[PDB]
Amino acid sequence: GEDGIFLVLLGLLMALVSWSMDYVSAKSLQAYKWSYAQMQPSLPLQFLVWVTFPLVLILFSALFCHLISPQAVGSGIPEMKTILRGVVLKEYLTMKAFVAKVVALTAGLGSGIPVGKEGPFVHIASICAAVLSKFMSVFYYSDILTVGCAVGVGCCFGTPLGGVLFSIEVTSTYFAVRNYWRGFFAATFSAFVFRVLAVWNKDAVTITALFRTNFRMDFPFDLKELPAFAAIGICCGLLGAVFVYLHRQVMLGVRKHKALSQFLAKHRLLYPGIVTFVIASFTFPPGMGQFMAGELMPREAISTLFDNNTWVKHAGDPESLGQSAVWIHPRVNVVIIIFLFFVMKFWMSIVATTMPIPCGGFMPVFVLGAAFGRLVGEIMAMLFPDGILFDDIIYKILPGGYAVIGAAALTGAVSHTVSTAVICFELTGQIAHILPMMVAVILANMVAQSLQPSLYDSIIQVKKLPYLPWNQLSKYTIFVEDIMVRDVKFVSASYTYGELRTLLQTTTVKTLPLVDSKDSMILLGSVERSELQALLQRHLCPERSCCIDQSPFQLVEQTTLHKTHTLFSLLGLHLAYVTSMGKLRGVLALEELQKAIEG
């Protein structure tokens, strides 16, 4: 209840900063489109302004990623899912770097290029959670991490339950119940406040999800195109896996040669923008948007792509429809335009996420899934223009739900989870296609689990971070024999004045192994050095309460590394006093286990 007050204040400021950032980003994009409309149609001058805006904005964000933030480039979720695996980086969790990312992320979201949103927003959300936890309870750790992840994605998209499911279902092994209680509570409140303020100030008539894709919802599917639903898993996940492979094909491409390393050391700044320059050469709407339709910021691009009609029979008319008018070449078949759409988008999304930016890998992946979905919907509308008969009512198909199941399925394959489709129908506003997208997402996840590793697993692999992985292969010859450290810290309780001042003047660390005697070698517990210092100074001052805890563990010295990994996984505890008969024999660390599981 009262911790829930902490939670709702958290989600309050989360909704504030989310509304602020997308408000300013939308104003920026509409101001750009305002000017680019209003000046004149001059093909040197439209090209001029078309190349002036993006890289000024992008390299402004890149300056903020470079100079103020020392290490926060390429940030997102995999570093904090490694933090909940144990490796703490408090210098990386800096509040000052916090502001260094988000407004740059605003300039990231100010980009006309597709960018990532949620991963950095998850990270800065966990920053907000940790800092406000520092401010509160004076006026539990991976709990705050998991809560931060849940409220971050659920305040990105106003999606509570898919947000908490997307937090817990991948970034854990076990999970505590007070944490999901806090999770859905703050996530529901965050999704609540995020939607109302756009009705408070700048009308968003009362509630959509974000996107109301209106359908007839009467005889929707049917099950005759259900074998076509076979396709809506399989190849989708296939190409998603290829994406992962190609991402590694450029991550090694980050550091395959020394010459680009040397010129990067010569000047770090110029590298992303120039190649964005050439896809700026592949964005230009009257030059090459004649054959790509580059007039599409991705949000309204997919809302227009979610049009509840058949564009093959709307290839029958030259009618001024809504924004879907941008989907017509006057003499080229529109299956060819969806061809050039998906091909240019997949080989531009890779270099979009390649550049040194804190990037999530979800939103261009959404637009390619939606592209494939309305692709297959329009081409089977071409193959079957007939529809069915029903009681005095002909029911033909429509590809909007096909677009939304593609933009659930392929990104679920990419994300190696199922919560992505939960976000997908939760933003869709209608829940006709639930069990087909569920079947497709589990098909694509088992394809992707069969073939390739994850995105973020490959990310922590290439970045070579300290992580725990494992793969359930307990071989014959692995023993804890060269791993424990036979350095022994020790305190006897029998230490008097000189010995106590010696302990004051010698050691450094926060808590200590406490034994009976150093000849006994048998551990008793662990004691705060700080409490000892406090007791000694506050007994030495008034011149002129021994509480004891225990060590909950012992490593029997012939345990396999897989079962020891399992042990530290279920404990969630860091170090090991590997003893024999009570008598301490070695010290085992988490990083030592990681270096062992290298083998």
Next chain:
Amino acid sequence: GEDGIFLVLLGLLMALVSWSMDYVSAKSLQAYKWSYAQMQPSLPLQFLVWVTFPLVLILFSALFCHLISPQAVGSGIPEMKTILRGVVLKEYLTMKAFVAKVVALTAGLGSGIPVGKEGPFVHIASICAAVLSKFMSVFYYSDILTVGCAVGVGCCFGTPLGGVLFSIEVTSTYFAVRNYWRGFFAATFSAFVFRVLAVWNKDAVTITALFRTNFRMDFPFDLKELPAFAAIGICCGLLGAVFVYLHRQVMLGVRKHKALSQFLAKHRLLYPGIVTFVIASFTFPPGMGQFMAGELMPREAISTLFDNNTWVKHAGDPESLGQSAVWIHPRVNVVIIIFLFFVMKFWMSIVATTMPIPCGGFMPVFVLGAAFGRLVGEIMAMLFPDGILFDDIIYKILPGGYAVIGAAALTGAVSHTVSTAVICFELTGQIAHILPMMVAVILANMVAQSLQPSLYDSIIQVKKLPYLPWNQLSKYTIFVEDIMVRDVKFVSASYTYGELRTLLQTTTVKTLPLVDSKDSMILLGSVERSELQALLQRHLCPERSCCIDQSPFQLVEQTTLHKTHTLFSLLGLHLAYVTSMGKLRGVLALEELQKAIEG
């Protein structure tokens, strides 16, 4: 993948038995209504047939609950959520009692009284999972329990994600990720196959959820009635808590006196039916259904209750609408009919779940939540008949979504969870009212968590079962001093022929504490007695491979009971070799911890 084949065969037979049971139940109810229509309107004779059908059917089910099943009366979820807390009852998990429940549950679902469905279906689902796991892997325990619970509720209602959420979120403390993978996989497949077969044989045009409650979904709520949404939590959860209290008011009412105990021992059979007899006297449609409208099996009763119109302005017409025509008295205001509706339903649902039947406590609770929802919707339609203005379109309110948020909210309060509302909108077919029902469910859950215990917690309390509870109150004076058992089983590895045959001829249990020597008292590990017997017989026969595992634990002998409860909770392990300096000093059991936490 291949364990997923086991999973989909499981969910296949689950969908088979679910389709079978509700198919036969629907045929039974329509055959009853067929006869009760077709004979004649005679008030002695309609009363005659009206009292003949139900208790014949009910006491048929009660005979199956009594005679064939020795202990399976009052079954459901709380016994198996206690089983995953450790207490195994394999005699209670009998396949033969399995068939003894379900067809009786069919006669339970054949009843015109509101009954429970999911709890017994969860239990028999876990029975199916355990038996098929016994049959497979020859051609992990609470994993099978949690999978059984998830697939049971998700095959009850065709609801995968709310089903797996309803399995995990209450019946656990920690939870493993392979288990939810299996969970949503089989749950999605079960929900898939359950819906298609009603289109295969007996048309259910292709896909609803179950109930397509069609709404205008255009300016739906608005936020001006949002303070009325304050009410839709609070009092709802209030009365739900009163329900729990009143349930205990009859559970003690089960065993408050000795005279009814003596007459129950005289003949167990007659007790439920007679009081059902008198509410049969409170069911009769021309006698007292003039003032209760008893012509309502609950499924179509709530689908009719989900009518997307205002019955106050439809109190304006005598028009033959659909089934909603049964909601009219020709001279009594319909707020008074909803008065008698909710009052008779809440004091009949208690004695419905009271009787010795395996019963869930959800479906009449759904109908009272829906009753309160359309109650408040119709009365604010009376208070505000105006609606709003919009662009040449007047938008007035409609109480169907109000009915569905009530039938999410109060049953979420009753169930002490949030997954119930997930099932609610997942069966609703439209997801307009998501964030209001989320806000209402968290309000009602915090009210119910503030006031009263759970249903099933009170159930295991009154049934006095062996369970672990706790309540985060570590007092000053609790120590593990009178709890460990100083009986020591011991085997030395140095035992030769006569000593080994002595160990063969003496002990009983499956695995044993293995020590170095009995004078050492220091435990080494645990060894299967069966493997020892096998080695000795298969070395004694060919006349005429010592593998060693370790004991992963030690209880330091001054641990508090709350932290020891926490220890066994996080381990998921049963017994404790409480040693000192290696040397074994006591044996601590789970039931001993339960008897300690009695204090």
